[PDB]
Symmetry: C3
């Protein structure tokens, strides 16, 4: 690619990489939520 | 819409979706940080 | 600056800021994983 097409393509690839990283953060936060809830339930 | 406006709107919608997920994750991490700190303060 | 170069520079500055935010949150979730693991290991 080249020109505007290369510039748009770089932006889209970087968005896709950020999207994959965000999806993994969502599931790391939900796995934490479950481990923290288990600790809270145990202490109670 | 089509052509460059369609392509630029697809990029802006994807960037906005990623920004919204980061703002929801910032709140979920603040809530987990407070819950983890309360567990650590109880245990100590 | 104006036209397409202004629109593209605005998208690039916003995408860069979102990528920085996601990398900070990847480290913050790993810090909370370590804290939660310490709590689990002690309780066990």
């Amino acid at each position: 690619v080249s020109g505007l097409v290369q510039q748009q393509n770089n932006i889209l690839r970087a968005l896709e990489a950020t999207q994959h990283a965000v999806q993994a953060l969502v599931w790391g936060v939900k796995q934490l939520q479950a481990r923290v809830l288990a600790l809270e339930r145990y202490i109670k």
